[PDB]
Structure formats: C-alpha cells, structure tokens
C-alpha cells in the first residue's frame, strides 16, 4: 500500500506472481461483472415490484448493499495509484468539502494530509480489505428478510398454492447461470482483459498533471453524469447522492393495487424508458461537456428522477382505474 | 517553501512547480493577457476580482493549480476563456485565473508569496 | 473593450463653470481601478486634475483642488467634472482616462477619452 | 510637486532611423515612470508602463531604461506612424506630473 | 471536440498477434529488442523489464548474459565501506539513459520520455496507434499550423504537437536476420517488442 | 530499400478520391497563403488551417493502406 | 530534529544543531546530485554511511 510501491507491486503482481495476472484481471473484470449483474437484480426487483408488499425491508438493505459496494470498488480502484486512481481518489473525497462548516476538514480528515498522498493510499486499502466482510455481513441480513417471505414470483400474486423445494430444481437451475456466467468472466479475463478499463491507469499516477482523458468506471457513469448536469458544486452531490437515495421511494410511490409489469401495459413500456434513459444518462458521461450532451444529460436526469417522483405513481392510479372501469357495469 | 527562477520563464508560458504537495502555475503573461485580464467587467464573474487584487507584478500570475471544483489541476492554454480548463467536470479560467463557466464556485487560489529579483519564493 | 466618451460644454464664458461628463461602456466604474481627468494646454503641458474610486473617494491636484468636484452616475456609468470659476488660464482640452494600479508596477492610465477641446471666451452661443 | 524636465524638445529625424528621447526627476521617482504618445488628430495612447513594460498593442521596436532620475523612450525606425508628441509621468506621489513634451517631425 | 484535439484516429493494421488462436511473432519481438537498443533507449527507459525475461523469448540464455554485462550497477560496498560497480546480471532490470527526472527533461528540452515499458497498455489503439505514430511525421505540418519551436507535428498525437521528433528513417540498422529494415518495417518491430514488454 | 508505407501512400495518392482530397487539401493551403501576406495577419483571431483537410486526405489513405501493409512487411 | 523542540531545546537552537549537517536535497536544473543544510523535519544524522 506504501504510495511509492503501490504501482509497482501490483504491476509485480501482473509480471512476476504465479498466475498473477489471473488473479489481477479475475479481480478487476469481476469487479464490473459484480456491477453488470447487481443492476440487472436490482432491475428485475425494479420491475417485478419487489420492492414492495412485506419485502421493503429486504429492498431497503439491499439499497445499503449498492452504496456499500460502490464504496468498496473506489476503494479499490484507488490501491493501483494509477493516473485515473488518485483523481478518482482526490474529486470524491473532496465530494464531501461541499458540506458547509466542517467541510474541508473532513476532507483533510480522510486524506490524512494536506492532499492524497501515502497516508490516503495506506488507509484506503485497509478500507478496501474490510468493507467486503461488513458487505458479507449486510447479505446475511438481505437473505434473512428475504428467507420470511420468500421470493415472489414474475405473475407477481402468491406463491404459497404451488412450492417447489429450493433443492434439485433450484440448485441445478442456478448452475446453468453459474456456469454461463463463468464462460463470458473467461472471455474477458483471457481475451479481452482491458477492455473494460481506462488506459490512463496504466500511467502512474502524478499530483501535477490530471490527464484531459480522464473518465470514470464505466459502472459510475451514470451518477457521474447527474453530478455534472447540476452547475452548481452543492446542489451536484446533493442530487448525485440523491439519485441513489430516491429507490427508498418507490415502495410510497407505487399506488398500483397489483404487484409487477407482468399485465401493465403503460408500466412497461414506461419501465424501459427508464432502463434506456438510465444506459443514455451513462453514455453522456463517457461524453465531454459539450452543448448538445449538457442539455440532455440534464433532460436525462430530470426524466431519471421524474420517474419515481411522477410517472409511476400518476402511471398505476391510471392503471388501477383503467382495471376497474373496463369490466365493471354496476 | 519554494524558489522558482522567474528569469528563465519565457515570455507566453506556463510553468507548474511543487508546493507542499500542491501545484503552483506561474505564468509570464503577455500585454494582451495582461489587458484582457483587466478589462473584463466584474458583473460577468461568478466570483468577482480584479486582476490587480489577485496579481503583485501584472506580469506574473502566481496561483494554485486546484480547481475549486472537486480539486483537479486545470488544464493550461485550453477552455474558452483563454486560460485553463479543469477536464473533471468542465470548469473554465480565464487570464487571470478567474472561473467563468462550470460548477467551480471560486477564482482559482492566490497563495502567499514575495519577489526577491529574478526569483520568486513561494509559501 | 472599454470605451470612454467626453461629452458637454464645449465653450464658457468665464465667471461660470466648466462642466464635462465622460461615458464609459465595457466596463462598470463601480467595478474597475481609477478614474481621472487631465487637461492639455496649447503649451504643450499635461496636467493631472484629479481622480475618483470605483469606491467614491477622491483625490484631486493641490492646484485646483478648491475649485473642482468629481462626482459619478452609476446608473447611467459617467464620472463628471466641474470646475468652478473659470478663467482664460483653463482653457485646454480635457481627456478623461482609466489607470490601475498593482502593488509592484504603480498607476497606469491605460483607457483614455476622445478629448474634449473646451474654449474660455466671452463669446456667444445658443445653449 | 515633483517635475520632469523632457529634452530633447520638438526634435526631428529622417524616415527610418533610432531615436532617444529622456525625463528627469527633481526628487527620487524609483521607476514609476510612464510613457504616453500623442497622435496628431488628438489620440492619446500608453506607450510604456513602470520604466520598462510594454503596454498591448506597443510595437516591440519600442524599448525603455533608466532609473531614479535618468529615463529614456528608445524606438528601432521610425517607419512610419511614429511622428506624434511623446510626454512621461512619474506616480510615487500625488499629484502625478507630465514632461514637457518631445514633439516628432519627419525630416 | 475538434478533430484535431482528439488527434487522428489510428487504423487498424493487421498484427500476427491480434487473434484468440495468435501468439506474438517472436523473431520480430527480436528485430524489434535490437531497435529499441540502437536507436530508443538513448531517450526511453524500460524501467520493469528485467534481463531474465528476454530468455526463451526473444534471445537466448548466453546472449541475454552478455547484454547485461555490457551495463554497471551498484553491488555493496566493499570491506572497508566505499561503494563499488559491478557487471549486470540476469536479475536486474534494463537500465535506463538518464539518472533522474531533471536530467531527462533537461536532455529532451523540458519534455519527458515516458517509460515504454506499458505505452501499449498506457494508451488507446495500443500496437496501431504506437505504429502509426513512429511512422505518421509528415514532412511538413498541414497548411496553418503555427507550431511551437522545438515541436513536430504528427496528426495521430492528440494536439499535433509532440515533443519527440521523427526518429526512424530508413536502413538506420542492420538487422542480424537479414530483414530490410525499413522505416515501417522497423516501426513494426518494435511496436510487437513493446507490446510483449507490457503483456 | 524504399519504405513499404510509403510506396503504398503514393500509389494511393494518385487515384481519384487520391487526387480529389488532396486537391481540396491544396486548395486549401493556397488559400490560407495568401491570409498570411495580407494586412495584419499577426492580428485577427480567426485564422484558418488546413487540418481538417489533411486529416480527409490522411484517414482516406490510412483505410486504403493499413489492411495491405502488412504482407509487405517481414 | 523536530522531536527536541520543546522537550530538552528551543526551536532556534535545534534549527541551528541541524543546520549543521549536509542532507541530500533535489538534484538541480541538470539533473546534478547537490546537498543541503539539516532541517527541522529530519532526523539525526549517524557517523557511518553504512
Ligand atoms: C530522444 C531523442 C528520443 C528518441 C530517440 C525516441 N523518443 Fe520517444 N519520446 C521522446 C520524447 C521527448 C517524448 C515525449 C513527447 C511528448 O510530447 O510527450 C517521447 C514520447 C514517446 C511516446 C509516447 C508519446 C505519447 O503518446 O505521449 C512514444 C509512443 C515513443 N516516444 C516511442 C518511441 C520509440 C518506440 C522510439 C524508438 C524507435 C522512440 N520513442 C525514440 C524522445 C525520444
Ligand atoms: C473511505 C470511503 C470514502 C472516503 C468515500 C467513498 C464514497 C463515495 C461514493 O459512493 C459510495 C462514490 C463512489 C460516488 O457515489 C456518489 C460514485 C457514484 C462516484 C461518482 C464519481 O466518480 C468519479 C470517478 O470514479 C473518477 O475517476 C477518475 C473521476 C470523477 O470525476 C473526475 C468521478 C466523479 O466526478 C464522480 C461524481
Ligand atoms: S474539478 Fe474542475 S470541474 Fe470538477
């Protein structure tokens, strides 16, 4: 972790560890494939409304896991001290110097310094080992809010008619996944295991100079880009985080009486809106601040925001009317 | 502290030195610079300042290269202001080292500093 | 850029006053460095009559100091001068200029006034 | 009241050749000397600033010296705008004080 | 962003090592070591390879031995404490041409040259950009473009304007495998030995 | 020998998208010569280059070039 | 040095104890290896180099 060989011990890992750079590009790819995998179980939640009923409880720990995680990804991103790894490891630890009065002393408090150097590095590795078993920990709560109701189901109504044990059937179903995602993991680890990160971390990372290519992990994009349509310094983390924070509401604002996308016709179509504006919200991130992009990333965002504040809950109370008028005749 | 040659400093030039882990651009600015740095209204700066306020010797700018943003260093001879421009998130400086468009709420940093002839020490 | 426009009283009688205004554009008085007057007589010497602030205070030359006023407009952004009193003797032509100041290099007027070529004679004119 | 004392007065040269003109202090100005020219029509711009810098827009065939009490307002030719009135100020302390004037005639 | 700022987008050459079934072509990893040897590591260090590494790869246990020995590092003061030289050995790792940082820039006008040992890895492109760039110096940049003294312009470097000047000209080495050593065929070269450096 | 890629640049500068991009390139750089002699040149904040140009005519030859190079080369 | 001021010395004494020895220091423009008088952020210098 020492500043002046963090580099170059991971690169000693890469070139002289037995398997070394298995273990490196394991470790890095399954880093996003965590990420490409958690959005999609969030979506599936997301869309099979199990946010809601008795299971909010499980949906609010598994927002704590998402904050959780990301957490422990920066973390690690900052131990390479790559180029893109000390500006990552400077702007979000300086997100919290917009916080008024003590401000910039946390700040300082979290650097240990006058700026991110050794003392930074050191802690944020001693950060990174121990955040994953606190993570560990928050999944055994997941499983056990989860393990008194069980799982629902795509028809989104109860299960409790037709059960099937979790054993043979279950086990060997997972497996198939399992395995699937092992060969994509393999093509990437093996063929293709650059690809989904940034050159610049392969520069040694330098206190003068932040490179004008300087991007964020794909997986933050997203949030990135919210942060950078707000042109005020406060206002952007505060939306930002925000952002992340307005998934609490969707067990409120969601007034449809019958649970999942499965038989909503305006839901799901206005569901993918949202998955697409969310991919496009990503891709003006990996874009520069430049007059067409700035202007729909903020349309972007008001849409992201506007769709568990507005759409959902105007949506279903139509629905749930458009349900009763068309087969009531009293 | 630090002690930078001023007289090896070209004349439209930038230059980035070390201070207490922090970068310190020191810019021989041209007659134009110099004028077009104090010759912009007030009313037009998010953080008002005059050239003067910020510069001891109208031929030196003496700063911090840290926007004020989320601290990147502002990239020099770029933006639309002719100054600097922070990649990070799109911050731009202008010649005096004022911010002008982006979420950067203050002009960038005057730090403490005296001339001693040809040389400048800085801290 | 900054402009200065000298507008007024191109001809006194004397035992009156002498008042010229000055009009600057592409930049705030309120905001900027120094705002002076200067006149120059057909002897070929420069005067410094006096200056205002961009804060509002004045500072005018031991000369003429108890006979002239700079004051200003913000609003329509013009710095004035009267001088009260007139004789032959100020008869010159008068330029409104901007000078700055930086701890190192001095003053500097930089930003200077069309110049306005006031007359003192005890002719006639229609006002 | 400090003065300056500018000579040569209402000189004149040919059309393509060095000239110096020069300000003298009666009290210690350091170098808080300005040089300002002065068009025939009526235009009064800066020439040069604080002994030696050069104001925007000031040809660099346009030098400056001295110190204390001894200044001077060099050129490389004359070529051909230069023929104008060419004062110089000192601002140690108020009130601030022009020279006599250097009138320029093309010969 | 401008064309320009961006810099030319690097085609795509058909490298023998671009392939899920393709390994790098060693022979032209060999051509390309003895490239950087006489006319790259006069300005660019390769600071994380060490002699070892070149053994079974692209030069053989004695040959390798003998390049390290043509170089002196540190070895521990002797009985009495004064510091003393010694002949390199497989163990250590290729020396580069400057002593520091100062010296480097003061010897490339204020620039620095970057460590080559990652520049595949380090940039966008990789092998095409790294080759296209060696090879894409014009004899004189495009009409307009007011470039810096002590700069050269090169399209592919996002700018234009690039510290390092054209390097590689023709026949400027003679390859020991009888190979005509063009200027893109040198470009070649080293571009594959530079990628097997990084991976 | 003669440089395999630039034996390549040449047959493919004379073809005809060849001969028309860098005729536009050209007519390009007579066109920026002649700003440069007239009447302050040194001042005007909008001076134009010629590298969008070039880079037409440097990406055409790039495409026609780069799948070929290579089985020249050893 | 720091850790006396204070504690057995005052900061100019200790300022001027270390003074007294040469440290290492950034090698100049050219890259030459060049020394410089102690300060208060170092330590204790011992009598052999190795
Ligand atoms: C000293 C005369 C040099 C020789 C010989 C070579 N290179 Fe170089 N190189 C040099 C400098 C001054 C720089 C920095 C330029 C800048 O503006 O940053 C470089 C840079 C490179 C780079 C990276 C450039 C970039 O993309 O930022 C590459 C890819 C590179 N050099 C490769 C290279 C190779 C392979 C050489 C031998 C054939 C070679 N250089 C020689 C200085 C010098
Ligand atoms: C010990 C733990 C500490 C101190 C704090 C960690 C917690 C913070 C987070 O949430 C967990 C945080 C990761 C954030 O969440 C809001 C993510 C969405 C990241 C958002 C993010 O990333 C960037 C990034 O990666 C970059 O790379 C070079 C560069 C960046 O700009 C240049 C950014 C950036 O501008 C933002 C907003
Ligand atoms: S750090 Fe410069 S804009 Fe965010």
Same mark, same amino acid.
């Given at each position: 972790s020492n500043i002046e060989l963090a580099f170059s011990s991971v690169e000693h890992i890469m070139r002289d560890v037995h398997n070394g750079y298995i273990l490196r590009y394991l470790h890095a790819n399954g880093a996003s494939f965590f990420f490409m995998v958690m959005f999609m179980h969030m979506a599936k939640g997301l869309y099979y409304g199990s946010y809601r009923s008795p299971r909010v409880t499980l949906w609010n720990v598994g927002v704590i896991i998402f904050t959780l995680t990301i957490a422990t990804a920066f973390l690690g991103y900052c131990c390479v001290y790559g180029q893109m790894s000390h500006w990552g490891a400077t702007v979000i630890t300086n997100l919290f110097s917009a916080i008024p009065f003590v401000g910039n002393d946390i700040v300082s408090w979290l650097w240990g310094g006058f700026s991110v150097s050794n003392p930074t590095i050191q802690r944020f590795f001693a950060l990174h080992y121990l955040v994953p078993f606190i993570i560990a920990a928050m999944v055994i709560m997941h499983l056990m809010a989860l393990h008194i109701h069980g799982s629902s189901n795509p028809l989104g109504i109860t299960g409790n008619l037709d059960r099937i044990p979790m054993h043979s059937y279950f086990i060997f179903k997972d497996l198939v996944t399992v395995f699937l995602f092992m060969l994509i993991l393999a093509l990437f680890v093996f063929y293709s295991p650059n690809t989904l990160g940034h050159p610049d971390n392969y520069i040694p990372g330098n206190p003068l100079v932040t490179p004008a290519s300087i991007v964020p992990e794909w997986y933050l994009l997203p949030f990135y880009a919210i942060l950078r349509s707000i042109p005020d310094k406060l206002l952007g983390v505060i939306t930002m985080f925000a952002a992340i924070l307005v998934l609490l509401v969707l067990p409120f604002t969601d007034r449809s009486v019958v649970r999942g996308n499965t038989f909503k016709v305006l839901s799901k179509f206005f569901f993918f809106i949202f998955v697409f504006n969310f991919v496009l919200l990503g891709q003006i991130g990996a874009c520069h601040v430049e007059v067409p992009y700035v202007l729909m990333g903020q349309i972007a965002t008001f849409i992201?925001?506007?769709?568990?504040?507005?759409?959902?809950?105007?949506?279903?109370?139509?629905?749930?009317?458009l349900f009763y008028i068309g087969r009531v005749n009293k | 502290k630090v002690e930078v040659n001023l007289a090896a400093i070209p004349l439209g =030039?930038? &230059?980035?030195?070390?201070?207490?882990? =922090?970068? &310190?651009?020191?810019?021989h600015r041209t007659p134009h610079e110099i004028q077009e740095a104090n010759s912009v209204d007030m009313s037009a700066l998010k953080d008002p300042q005059t050239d003067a306020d910020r510069v001891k010797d109208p031929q030196w700018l003496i700063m911090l290269g840290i926007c004020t943003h989320l601290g990147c260093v502002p990239i020099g001879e770029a933006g639309d202001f002719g100054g600097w421009f922070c990649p990070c998130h799109g911050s731009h400086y202008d010649i005096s080292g004022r911010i002008r468009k982006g979420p950067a709420p203050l002009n960038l940093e005057i730090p403490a500093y005296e001339f001693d002839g040809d040389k400048v020490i800085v801290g | 850029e900054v402009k200065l426009q000298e507008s007024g009283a191109g001809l006194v009688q004397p035992s009156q006053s002498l008042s010229l205004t000055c009009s600057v554009t592409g930049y705030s008085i309120t905001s900027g460095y120094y705002w002076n007057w200067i006149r120059l007589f057909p002897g070929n010497k420069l005067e410094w009559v006096g200056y205002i602030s961009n804060v509002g205070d004045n500072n005018y030359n031991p000369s003429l100091k108890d006979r002239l006023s700079i004051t200003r407009?913000?609003?329509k952004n013009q710095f004035f001068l009267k001088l009260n009193s007139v004789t032959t003797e100020d008869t010159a032509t008068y330029y409104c200029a901007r000078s700055e100041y930086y701890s190192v290099t001095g003053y500097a007027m930089d930003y200077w006034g069309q110049g306005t070529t006031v007359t003192v004679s005890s002719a006639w004119r229609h006002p | 009241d400090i003065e300056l004392t500018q000579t040569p007065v209402s000189?004149?040269?040919?059309?393509?050749?060095?000239?110096?003109?020069?300000?003298?202090?009666?009290?210690?100005?350091?170098?808080?000397?300005?040089?300002?020219?002065?068009?025939?029509?009526?235009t009064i711009k800066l020439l040069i600033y604080y002994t030696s810098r050069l104001h925007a827009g000031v040809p660099s065939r346009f030098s400056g010296s001295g110190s204390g009490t001894d200044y001077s307002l060099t050129i490389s030719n004359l070529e051909p705008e230069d023929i104008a009135t060419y004062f110089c100020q000192h601002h140690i302390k108020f009130p601030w004080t022009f020279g006599a004037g250097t009138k320029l005639e093309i010969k | 962003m401008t064309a320009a700022e961006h810099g030319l987008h690097a085609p795509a050459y058909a490298w023998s090592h671009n392939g899920p079934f393709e390994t790098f072509d060693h022979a032209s990893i060999r051509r390309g070591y003895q490239v950087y040897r006489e006319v790259c590591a006069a300005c660019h260090s390769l600071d994380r390879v060490a002699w070892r590494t070149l053994v079974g790869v692209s030069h053989t246990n004695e040959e390798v031995r003998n390049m390290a020995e043509e170089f002196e590092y540190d070895d521990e003061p002797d009985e009495q404490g004064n510091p003393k030289k010694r002949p390199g050995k497989l163990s250590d790792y290729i020396p580069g041409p400057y002593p520091n940082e100062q010296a480097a820039r003061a010897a490339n006008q204020g620039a620095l040259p970057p460590d080559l040992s990652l520049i595949v890895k380090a940039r966008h492109g990789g092998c095409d950009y790294i080759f296209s760039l060696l090879t894409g110096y014009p004899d004189e940049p495009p009409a307009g473009v007011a470039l810096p003294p002590?700069?050269?312009?090169?399209?592919?470097?996002?700018?234009?304007?690039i510290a390092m000047a054209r390097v590689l000209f023709d026949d400027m080495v003679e390859y020991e495998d009888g190979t005509p050593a063009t200027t893109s065929q040198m470009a070649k070269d080293v571009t594959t030995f530079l990628n097997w450096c990084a991976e | 020998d003669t440089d395999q890629l630039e034996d390549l640049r040449e047959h493919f500068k004379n073809t005809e998208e060849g001969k028309a991009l860098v005729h536009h390139y050209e007519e390009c750089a007579e066109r920026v010569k002649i700003q440069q002699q007239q009447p302050g040149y040194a001042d005007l904040e909008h001076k134009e280059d010629c590298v969008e140009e070039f880079f037409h005519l440097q990406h055409y030859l790039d495409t026609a070039t780069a799948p070929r190079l290579f089985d020249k080369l050893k």
């Amino acid at each position: 972790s020492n500043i002046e060989l963090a580099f170059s011990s991971v690169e000693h890992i890469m070139r002289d560890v037995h398997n070394g750079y298995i273990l490196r590009y394991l470790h890095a790819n399954g880093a996003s494939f965590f990420f490409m995998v958690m959005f999609m179980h969030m979506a599936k939640g997301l869309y099979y409304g199990s946010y809601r009923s008795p299971r909010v409880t499980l949906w609010n720990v598994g927002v704590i896991i998402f904050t959780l995680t990301i957490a422990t990804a920066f973390l690690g991103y900052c131990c390479v001290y790559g180029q893109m790894s000390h500006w990552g490891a400077t702007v979000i630890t300086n997100l919290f110097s917009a916080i008024p009065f003590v401000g910039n002393d946390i700040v300082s408090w979290l650097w240990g310094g006058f700026s991110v150097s050794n003392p930074t590095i050191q802690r944020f590795f001693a950060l990174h080992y121990l955040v994953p078993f606190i993570i560990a920990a928050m999944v055994i709560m997941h499983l056990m809010a989860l393990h008194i109701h069980g799982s629902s189901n795509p028809l989104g109504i109860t299960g409790n008619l037709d059960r099937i044990p979790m054993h043979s059937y279950f086990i060997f179903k997972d497996l198939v996944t399992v395995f699937l995602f092992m060969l994509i993991l393999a093509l990437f680890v093996f063929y293709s295991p650059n690809t989904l990160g940034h050159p610049d971390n392969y520069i040694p990372g330098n206190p003068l100079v932040t490179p004008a290519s300087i991007v964020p992990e794909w997986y933050l994009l997203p949030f990135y880009a919210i942060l950078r349509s707000i042109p005020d310094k406060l206002l952007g983390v505060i939306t930002m985080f925000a952002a992340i924070l307005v998934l609490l509401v969707l067990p409120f604002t969601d007034r449809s009486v019958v649970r999942g996308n499965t038989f909503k016709v305006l839901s799901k179509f206005f569901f993918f809106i949202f998955v697409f504006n969310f991919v496009l919200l990503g891709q003006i991130g990996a874009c520069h601040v430049e007059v067409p992009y700035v202007l729909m990333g903020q349309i972007a965002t008001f849409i992201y925001f506007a769709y568990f504040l507005i759409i959902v809950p105007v949506i279903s109370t139509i629905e749930n009317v458009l349900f009763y008028i068309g087969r009531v005749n009293k | 502290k630090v002690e930078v040659n001023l007289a090896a400093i070209p004349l439209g =030039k930038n &230059v980035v030195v070390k201070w207490q882990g =922090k970068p &310190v651009f020191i810019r021989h600015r041209t007659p134009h610079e110099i004028q077009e740095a104090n010759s912009v209204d007030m009313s037009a700066l998010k953080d008002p300042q005059t050239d003067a306020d910020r510069v001891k010797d109208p031929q030196w700018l003496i700063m911090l290269g840290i926007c004020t943003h989320l601290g990147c260093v502002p990239i020099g001879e770029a933006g639309d202001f002719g100054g600097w421009f922070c990649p990070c998130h799109g911050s731009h400086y202008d010649i005096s080292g004022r911010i002008r468009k982006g979420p950067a709420p203050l002009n960038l940093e005057i730090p403490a500093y005296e001339f001693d002839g040809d040389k400048v020490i800085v801290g | 850029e900054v402009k200065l426009q000298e507008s007024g009283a191109g001809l006194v009688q004397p035992s009156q006053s002498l008042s010229l205004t000055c009009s600057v554009t592409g930049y705030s008085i309120t905001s900027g460095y120094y705002w002076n007057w200067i006149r120059l007589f057909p002897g070929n010497k420069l005067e410094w009559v006096g200056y205002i602030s961009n804060v509002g205070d004045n500072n005018y030359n031991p000369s003429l100091k108890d006979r002239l006023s700079i004051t200003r407009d913000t609003s329509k952004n013009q710095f004035f001068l009267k001088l009260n009193s007139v004789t032959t003797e100020d008869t010159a032509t008068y330029y409104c200029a901007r000078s700055e100041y930086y701890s190192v290099t001095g003053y500097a007027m930089d930003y200077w006034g069309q110049g306005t070529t006031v007359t003192v004679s005890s002719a006639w004119r229609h006002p | 009241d400090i003065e300056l004392t500018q000579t040569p007065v209402s000189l004149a040269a040919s059309l393509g050749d060095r000239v110096t003109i020069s300000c003298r202090a009666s009290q210690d100005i350091n170098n808080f000397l300005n040089w300002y020219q002065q068009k025939p029509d009526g235009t009064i711009k800066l020439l040069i600033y604080y002994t030696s810098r050069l104001h925007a827009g000031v040809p660099s065939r346009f030098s400056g010296s001295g110190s204390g009490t001894d200044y001077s307002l060099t050129i490389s030719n004359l070529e051909p705008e230069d023929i104008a009135t060419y004062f110089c100020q000192h601002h140690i302390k108020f009130p601030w004080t022009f020279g006599a004037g250097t009138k320029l005639e093309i010969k | 962003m401008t064309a320009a700022e961006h810099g030319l987008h690097a085609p795509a050459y058909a490298w023998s090592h671009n392939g899920p079934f393709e390994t790098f072509d060693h022979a032209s990893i060999r051509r390309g070591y003895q490239v950087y040897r006489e006319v790259c590591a006069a300005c660019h260090s390769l600071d994380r390879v060490a002699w070892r590494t070149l053994v079974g790869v692209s030069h053989t246990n004695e040959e390798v031995r003998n390049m390290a020995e043509e170089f002196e590092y540190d070895d521990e003061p002797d009985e009495q404490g004064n510091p003393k030289k010694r002949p390199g050995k497989l163990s250590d790792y290729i020396p580069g041409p400057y002593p520091n940082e100062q010296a480097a820039r003061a010897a490339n006008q204020g620039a620095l040259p970057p460590d080559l040992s990652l520049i595949v890895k380090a940039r966008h492109g990789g092998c095409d950009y790294i080759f296209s760039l060696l090879t894409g110096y014009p004899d004189e940049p495009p009409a307009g473009v007011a470039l810096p003294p002590g700069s050269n312009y090169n399209p592919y470097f996002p700018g234009g304007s690039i510290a390092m000047a054209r390097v590689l000209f023709d026949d400027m080495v003679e390859y020991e495998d009888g190979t005509p050593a063009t200027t893109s065929q040198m470009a070649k070269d080293v571009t594959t030995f530079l990628n097997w450096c990084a991976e | 020998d003669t440089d395999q890629l630039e034996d390549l640049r040449e047959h493919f500068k004379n073809t005809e998208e060849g001969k028309a991009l860098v005729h536009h390139y050209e007519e390009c750089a007579e066109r920026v010569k002649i700003q440069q002699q007239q009447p302050g040149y040194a001042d005007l904040e909008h001076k134009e280059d010629c590298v969008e140009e070039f880079f037409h005519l440097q990406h055409y030859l790039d495409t026609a070039t780069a799948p070929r190079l290579f089985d020249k080369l050893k």
